[PDB]
Design a binder for this molecule. Structure first.
Ligand SMILES: CCCCC/C=C/C/C=C\C/C=C\C/C=C\CCCC(=O)O[C@H](COC(=O)CCCCCCCCCCCCCCCCC)COP(=O)(O)O[C@@H]1[C@H](O)[C@@H](O)[C@H](OP(=O)(O)O)[C@@H](O)[C@H]1O
Ligand SMILES: *[C@@H]1O[C@H](CO)[C@@H](O[C@@H]2O[C@H](CO)[C@@H](O[C@@H]3O[C@H](CO)[C@@H](O)[C@H](O[C@@H]4O[C@H](CO)[C@@H](O)[C@H](O)[C@@H]4O)[C@@H]3O)[C@H](O)[C@H]2NC(C)=O)[C@H](O)[C@H]1NC(C)=O
Ligand SMILES: *[C@@H]1O[C@H](CO)[C@@H](O[C@@H]2O[C@H](CO)[C@@H](O)[C@H](O)[C@H]2NC(C)=O)[C@H](O)[C@H]1NC(C)=O
Ligand SMILES: *[C@@H]1O[C@H](CO)[C@@H](O[C@@H]2O[C@H](CO)[C@@H](O)[C@H](O)[C@H]2NC(C)=O)[C@H](O)[C@H]1NC(C)=O
Ligand SMILES: Nc1ncnc2c1ncn2[C@@H]1O[C@H](COP(=O)(O)OP(=O)(O)O)[C@@H](O)[C@H]1O
Ligand SMILES: *[C@@H]1O[C@H](CO)[C@@H](O)[C@H](O)[C@H]1NC(C)=O
Ligand code: ALF
Ligand SMILES: [Mg+2]
Ligand SMILES: [Mg+2]
Lengths: 355, 1064
């Protein structure tokens, strides 16, 4: 290496010399105005298509809260217009009516009664709407032991610490640890639309309402009933503690699986019943709802929802108008920039720079 | 008292000396972490996320995973660690070669030189160094091929010199020339302790049984290199790091940039808005958990414990919103500048063909400053001229002589002082005539041109002789004085011989003592002893330093030579002066002792011998003056015309005369024929005050038009500049220099070149650039911002201490206009985009506290958010920050007005910083309120009445966010290359494929159990594919319509150039 073949001349490739071929985009009026009229041309059929899909949805919402106070006990009085909401293809003649009913040992029940004015060919779904309930709270969304949901007999000292307030009561492992299970919505629905006056019943399905992964991961526990205790808010349905027969099966209990999926907003639906076999003929129906969950716990409301289904969820024109808003802004500036080009052009030379 | 024994390895091994190992590696496998962590955690972003991770380790506080921040911290830490380790590999690779070269050591057991390695060299081993190979250690010269034992070494590396030196050997040790007789040499070598003085040595060698004195003339440094002698026998004294090459270590200063300071202000801006977002949420939380204490009974809150609730909730929103300060920014901006320096130092237009010296950026932290330079502190000799000298004219005893009189001024009118030109033949006739009175003057003049200098001659096979002079004007005086009579033949220690081509005789002048030419001294002297027995002194230098040493008793050539210096400098010729003085032996007997004490002083030598040298230069008899030609470099008139057309002011700091710089300035298109020169040539401090006052008031008495301010130039010499730099007058000097388009300083001292640069930068806000060559403007380069060094004939002293080493001056027209405007515009947008992409996502975490009771719940997954700043949004910054060109390079030089864009700061400021920040807030709100209207009650799916949830909705937010972030970069880019299609559309397809794979495999390993069933409810839902089409267009319709408007009906300078570039 005495001579030292250095030759520090850099290569003449397009990369090292920054001579790579490229494309320079220019915003010429001939390359922008056709683009604005094109977006408006394709977003208008899609926009009017999504509002028609949301228009064909037929639903009915009955706020059954305040039924143990404002509803009658001896007869079916009309529900205040403040609560009922509905959308149907035909006009409704009879206003929905409700009546309170109590059973043995003080078991109240709200007996709603509505009218379906048209044959709904689409399948029927029934949710319940809970308002002002914050399931997206940081202390609440993570409060559940993921290993007990799988069915393992986790000891006390190995329990998840994310359920610290509700955990290891009276030196016994609370089996459904957490705030999500302890705060479960425990109202019961009739599971059948009792037809009234020349109308047959309409049975509803309770199975296959949760996610497919939930049924797979929620498995029957393997604890002993002499080493576990129910959560505090469940000491009414399971008094005297847990036994070999009272022990629930969380694999079949789909109402438990639907509740454990925390929602994103304080206004959320939860599926409970559905029917996809036959159509719903026109007539008058009745829904029995056991009143167990007080609205004083969360300060919100409780509703009874009966909807169908569409391509974009059910009855919502938020996505439909956005396609029309964007098509509207493009058509707006598409004409603004057009007349500005025809009347007052730039005429700022061509090759003469500003300096 | 260091004691060294010749040979006998068992004797000197007991002292415990070092080994010849060289290592410049900072990071080693023994103490890597104890110094790398202390260096990495010294910055702001790294220390901030260190405390964030330590805070995140408390229970029931972290809104995400416990290792979502320390995991990201280690990723950017090893990316910085691998680059800190690669540079140490190159340092270790370079140190391996210095320990791999060969070095033959005399082995007494073999009676011959046995080849070994440098690391095997021990103190006391006799080594044999061949020609053109460097010296391994500090070795004294014992013998060589020359009959006396001398050698010619090139002591570069440690210094910036390129010329040769001469080291002579003692007469006692020069006898041992044979290899076999080396075994008879024995004795002690008493030497000094390892020091750092490169020009001092006081050893003592006891050859055989009698001691002989040593001298610094018998010591070769490690960084030296043998040049002409065939072989040298050396005795090692200092080895390893104890040698004067590495023991005298150096330090490098750290320079901060303008963009670095603006970044520091933008970080404080984000840190303030961080505490605001934290306090807003922490206060809203503590008032809602107290007001609505009944409607939140299903949470089992603490209740009476609310003093610590604010502190625990303060830590929660600290960890949640800590992602607003991107840690990927500091590592990205460091690699962008490092990569841009690579693309700059690898260009053909910045490569010099005559000498293989490409542009190199030694400090890549100052690359963006090239697009915003306003002042240039240049230099004349070498920087503006080719620095190749040619003797053309002369003047002796008041008579001027040239070859071939041009035309008109042939005859001499003799109007007092002789004006005109003669022939060189008339000089010879006037010389050989013994009847003339000025004949001895001409003889003493010609002997001055070929004796007083310090040039080493070289003989070739063709019979000719070549002079290797350190200074290019030295070779002009030797060759100019030789091709007409007195030729310089051979040089040897303590002797200088010349040959008179007229009579054929040879004279031997005993070089008794010399004095080196210093750039501050501006004068060279050399005292000889003529063969007649007299001791005559010679001196030469500038007129501003010799005329102060003259006398008036017997000196009548002063008024004649002074007028000849005026007409020489008026043509652009580099002139000098000549003087002489005959000294006696009574005074030299004492002055010699003074010079010896000044040479062997351990205190200081760079200034001590300068004072002892002027002690003998009392009187001087001016003999005459010389004139040398020097032409400008190629393309320099075009670059200076273009640099001034871009709005850059050029200051020239020359150490030469005044009229020379003015003439070369008009030819260099720096000045003009209609430019009004404002000369300031004063003699006293009070005279400079009145001159500065008369300058400033005459300027403000009338308005300055465009044609008037453009035609101003300040010319101030060195003596006048020394007064105008005082604290009282520095304000008067600075206010008058800002009005003239060009400034020409003359006769400037080396240290005065730094005071001018420091005064302008400490009383202004503009960025300064200093370009020069040689050891006289090294302080000018270290004092400015962007220092540029030229590698010329003066050596390599200024090209190593600079930040950018350029072959010549022509390359500044592209290094600043093209590579400067690009580097500024690239790094500016890359940082503004890095702040926007990070705010457009993590701001949805703030609009969500209004929907979860101010709890601090994450909207997206813990690990999906960490991949945002690591995988999916780390390539668009690199493309737009390295491979982006907002205007063609062919048009960037045709219209130099574009340089004013970055010069003012039109691409990067705090006002524009807030524009990108509030643009992130706007896009953050569009995707937030847009999705909550579509996923109203979660009833947005069409799959047997099932509903989405918290995590199935956070994915739509995360996906729509990156489509708008990457969609923004599409409008920002100007050039669409192949690297762009991989970083902007390619990063999108990366996420559309990485998510179905990540969410279907990793939940099974207990990594992200929130994505167990989200793939079906998102990719399988027809609403997820419709929100990704309308929301990005709805949020980017503002930028698309605004870009069309500003380009069409409100264009700027480059908005019209980019249109001409497109359509032509
Ligand atoms: C039905 C409703 C539809 C809405 C549609 C609205 C349309 C107009 C909206 C606002 C109009 C206001 C201003 C727009 C009019 C003129 C803009 C001029 C000011 C401006 O350019 O600064 C911009 C910041 O941009 C915002 O800061 C953008 C800020 C916009 C402010 C809007 C309000 C934000 C306040 C925060 C909202 C928070 C809501 C909170 C909700 C809480 C929910 C709980 C800077 O980025 P830029 O990409 O444009 O930079 C330009 C651009 O790149 C290009 O033109 C140029 O290069 P070239 O020419 O060579 O390409 C380049 O040199 C540069 O000039
Ligand atoms: C449907 O869901 C409802 C809302 O969670 C739930 O209502 C709550 O039920 C729990 C369980 O009984 C109630 O908690 C008890 O409240 C009484 C006062 O009213 C307390 O005295 C009682 O503490 C007792 O303490 C004793 C001594 O320590 C102990 O021996 C007893 O076993 C018992 O623990 C409980 O704290 C709560 O007040 C109810 N209302 C609210 C707003 O939470 C319904 O029971 C539930 N229904 C069904 C059928 O599951
Ligand atoms: C969906 O609703 C239809 C309409 O009532 C149900 O069909 C009836 O089911 C009951 C249950 O045994 C039968 O006794 C009737 O004869 C059925 N009527 C007709 C016209 O088929 C159907 O079973 C429901 N599907 C469910 C609940 O899954
Ligand atoms: C279909 O609807 C009928 C009508 O309600 C259901 O029959 C009832 O079943 C419950 C459960 O055992 C009994 O308590 C009622 O007395 C039954 N009523 C009548 C009128 O038979 C029937 O169970 C439903 N089908 C299914 C599969 O549950
Ligand atoms: N070897 C030398 N000996 C004496 N004087 C010299 C020598 N070389 C140059 N000179 C003269 O002394 C001055 C030294 O100033 P200098 O820093 O070299 O200016 P420049 O930057 O133009 O090279 C020069 O202008 C010159 O007249
Ligand atoms: C349950 O049964 C007894 C205690 O009741 C004990 O031997 C056994 O280990 C317990 N656990 C299981 C899993 O059977
Ligand atoms: F022109 Al110079 F030092 F080379 F002032
Ligand atoms: Mg120079
Ligand atoms: Mg010089």
């Amino acid at each position: 290496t005495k001579e030292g073949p250095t030759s520090k001349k850099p290569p003449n490739t397009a990369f090292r010399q920054q001579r790579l071929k490229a494309w320079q985009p220019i915003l010429s009026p001939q390359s922008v105005l056709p683009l604005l009229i094109f977006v408006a041309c394709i977003f208008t059929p899609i926009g009017i298509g999504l509002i028609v899909s949301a228009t064909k949805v037929q639903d009915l919402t009955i706020d059954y809260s305040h039924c143990d106070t404002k509803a009658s006990t001896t007869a079916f009085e009309d529900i205040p217009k403040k609560y009922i909401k509905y959308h149907f293809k035909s006009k409704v003649e009879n206003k929905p009516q409700w009546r309170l009913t109590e059973n043995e040992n003080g078991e109240q029940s709200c007996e709603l009664q509505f009218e379906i004015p048209n044959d709904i060919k689409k399948s029927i779904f029934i949710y319940y709407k809970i308002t002002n309930f914050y399931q997206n709270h940081r202390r609440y969304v993570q409060s559940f032991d993921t290993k007990q949901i799988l069915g393992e007999p986790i000891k006390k000292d190995d329990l998840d610490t994310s359920c610290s307030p509700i955990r290891s009561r009276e030196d016994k492992i609370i089996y459904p640890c957490g705030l999500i299970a302890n705060s479960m919505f425990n109202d019961t629905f009739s599971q059948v639309l009792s037809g009234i006056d020349d109308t047959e019943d309409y049975n509803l399905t309770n199975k296959h309402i949760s996610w497919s992964i939930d049924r797979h991961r929620f498995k029957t526990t393997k604890y002993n009933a002499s080493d576990i205790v129910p959560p505090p808010n469940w000491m009414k349905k399971y008094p005297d503690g847990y036994t070999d027969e009272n022990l629930p099966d969380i694999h079949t209990w789909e109402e438990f699986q639907v509740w454990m999926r925390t929602a994103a907003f304080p206004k959320f639906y939860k599926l409970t019943l559905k029917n996809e076999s036959a159509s719903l003929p026109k007539g008058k129906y009745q829904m029995n709802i056991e009143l167990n969950y007080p609205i004083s716990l969360f300060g919100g409301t409780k509703s009874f929802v009966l909807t169908t289904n569409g391509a974009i969820g059910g009855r919502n024109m938020s996505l439909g108008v956005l396609y029309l808003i964007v098509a509207g802004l493009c058509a707006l500036f598409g004409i603004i920039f057009l007349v500005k080009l025809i009347f007052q052009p730039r005429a700022m030379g061509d090759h003469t720079y500003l300096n | 008292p260091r004691v060294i024994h010749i040979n006998d390895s068992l004797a000197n091994s007991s002292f415990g000396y070092s080994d010849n190992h060289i290592s410049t590696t900072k990071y080693n496998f023994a103490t890597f972490l104890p110094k790398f962590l202390f260096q990495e955690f010294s910055k702001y972003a790294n220390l901030f996320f260190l405390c964030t991770s330590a805070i995140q380790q408390v229970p029931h506080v972290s809104p995400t995973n416990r290792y979502t921040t320390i995991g990201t911290l280690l990723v950017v830490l090893i990316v910085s660690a691998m680059k800190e380790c690669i540079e140490d590999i190159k340092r270790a690779n370079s140190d391996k070669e210095l320990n791999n070269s060969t070095a033959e050591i005399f082995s007494e057991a073999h009676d011959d030189f046995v080849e070994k390695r440098w690391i095997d060299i021990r103190v006391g081993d006799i080594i044999r160094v061949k020609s053109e190979e460097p010296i391994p250690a500090d070795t004294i010269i014992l013998s060589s091929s020359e009959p006396e034992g001398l050698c010619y070494i090139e002591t570069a590396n440690l210094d910036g010199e390129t010329n040769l030196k001469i080291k002579q050997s003692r007469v006692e040790t020069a006898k041992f020339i044979d290899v076999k007789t080396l075994k008879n040499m024995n004795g002690k070598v008493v030497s000094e302790q390892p020091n750092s003085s490169l020009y001092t040595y006081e050893g003592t060698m006891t050859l055989n049984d009698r001691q002989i004195p040593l001298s610094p003339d018998q010591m070769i440094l490690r960084g030296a290199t043998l040049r002409n002698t065939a072989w040298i026998f050396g005795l090692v004294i200092f080895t390893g790091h104890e040698t004067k090459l590495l023991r005298n270590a150096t330090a490098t200063p750290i320079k901060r940039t303008a963009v670095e300071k603006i970044i520091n202000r933008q970080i404080i801006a984000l840190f303030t808005v961080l505490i605001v977002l934290i306090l807003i949420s922490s206060i809203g939380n503590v008032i809602m958990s107290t007001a609505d204490a009944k409607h939140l009974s299903y949470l089992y809150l603490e209740g009476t414990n609310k003093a610590g609730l604010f502190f625990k909730d303060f830590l929660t929103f600290w960890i949640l919103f800590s992602n607003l300060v991107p840690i990927s920014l500091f590592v990205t901006v460091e690699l962008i500048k490092y990569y841009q320096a690579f693309m700059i130092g690898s260009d053909l237009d910045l490569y010099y063909e005559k000498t293989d010296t490409p542009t190199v950026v030694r400090t890549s932290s100052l690359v963006e400053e090239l697009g915003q330079i306003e002042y240039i502190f240049s230099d004349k000799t070498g920087t503006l001229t080719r620095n190749i000298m040619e003797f053309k004219s002369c003047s002796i005893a008041g008579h001027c002589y040239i070859d071939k009189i041009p035309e008109d001024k042939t005859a001499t009118v003799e109007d007092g002082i002789e004006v005109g030109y003669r022939k060189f033949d008339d000089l010879k006739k006037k010389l050989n005539d013994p009847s003339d009175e000025d004949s001895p003057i001409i003889n003493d003049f010609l002997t001055l041109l070929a004796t007083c200098h310090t040039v080493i001659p070289e003989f070739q096979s063709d019979g000719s002789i070549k002079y290797q002079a350190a200074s290019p004007d030295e070779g002009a005086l030797v060759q100019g004085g030789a091709d007409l009579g007195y030729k310089f033949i051979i040089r040897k220690p303590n002797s200088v011989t010349v040959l008179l081509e007229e009579t054929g005789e040879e004279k031997e002048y005993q070089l008794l003592n010399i004095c080196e030419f210093n750039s501050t001294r501006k004068r060279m002297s050399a005292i000889f002893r003529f063969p007649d027995g007299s001791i005559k002194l010679f001196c030469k230098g500038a007129d501003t330093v010799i005329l102060e040493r003259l006398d008036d008793e017997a000196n009548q050539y002063v008024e004649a030579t002074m007028r000849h210096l005026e007409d020489y400098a008026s043509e652009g010729l580099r002139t000098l002066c000549l003087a002489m003085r005959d000294i006696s032996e009574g005074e030299y007997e004492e002055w010699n002792s003074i010079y010896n004490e000044a040479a062997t002083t351990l205190d200081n030598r760079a200034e001590k011998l300068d004072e002892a040298a002027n002690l003998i230069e009392k009187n001087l008899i001016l003999i005459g003056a010389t004139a040398i030609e020097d032409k400008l470099q190629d393309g320099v008139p075009e670059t200076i015309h273009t640099l001034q057309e871009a709005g850059i002011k050029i200051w020239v700091l020359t150490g030469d005369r005044q009229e020379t710089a003015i003439n070369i300035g008009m030819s260099c298109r720096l000045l003009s024929e209609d430019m009004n020169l404002l000369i300031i040539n004063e003699e006293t401090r009070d005279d400079t005050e009145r001159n500065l006052l008369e300058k400033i008031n005459a300027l403000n008495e009338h308005q300055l038009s465009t044609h008037d301010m453009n035609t101003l130039a300040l010319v101030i010499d060195g003596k006048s500049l020394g007064f105008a730099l005082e604290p009282e007058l520095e304000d008067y000097l600075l206010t008058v220099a800002k009005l003239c388009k060009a400034v020409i300083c003359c006769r400037v001292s080396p240290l005065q070149k730094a005071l001018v640069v420091k005064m302008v930068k400490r009383k202004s806000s503009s960025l300064l650039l200093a370009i020069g060559d040689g050891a006289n403007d090294v302080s000018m380069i270290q004092a400015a911002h962007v220092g540029v060094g030229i590698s010329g004939m003066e050596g390599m002293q200024a090209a190593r201490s600079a930040d950018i080493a350029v072959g010549q001056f022509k390359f500044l027209k592209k290094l600043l206009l093209v590579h400067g405007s690009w580097s500024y515009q690239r790094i500016s947008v890359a940082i503004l985009y890095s702040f926007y992409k990070n705010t457009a996502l993590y701001m949805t975490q703030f609009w969500y506290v209004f929907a979860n009771a101010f709890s601090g719940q994450s909207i997206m997954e813990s690990w999906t958010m960490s991949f945002y700043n690591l995988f999916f949004t780390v390539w668009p910054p690199f493309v737009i920050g390295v491979f982006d060109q907002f205007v063609s390079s062919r048009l960037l030089e045709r219209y130099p007005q574009l340089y004013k864009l970055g010069q003012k700061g039109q691409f990067f400021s705090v006002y524009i910083f807030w524009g990108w920040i509030i643009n992130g807030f706007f896009h953050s709100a569009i995707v937030f309120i847009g999705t909550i209207l579509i996923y109203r009650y979660g009833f947005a799916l069409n799959m047997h009445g099932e509903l989405a949830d918290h995590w199935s909705w956070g994915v739509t937010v995360y996906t729509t966010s990156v489509i708008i972030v990457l969609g923004k970069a599409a409008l920002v880019t100007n050039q669409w290359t192949k690297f762009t299609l991989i970083a902007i559309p390619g990063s999108l397809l990366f996420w559309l494929i990485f998510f179905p794979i990540y969410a279907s495999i990793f939940p099974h390993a207990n990594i992200s159990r929130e994505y167990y069933g989200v793939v079906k409810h998102t990719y399988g839902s027809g609403v997820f594919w419709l929100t990704l089409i309308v929301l990005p267009i709805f949020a980017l319709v503002r930028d698309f319509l605004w870009k069309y408007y500003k380009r069409m009906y409100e264009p700027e300078t480059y908005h019209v150039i980019q249109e001409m570039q497109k359509y032509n």
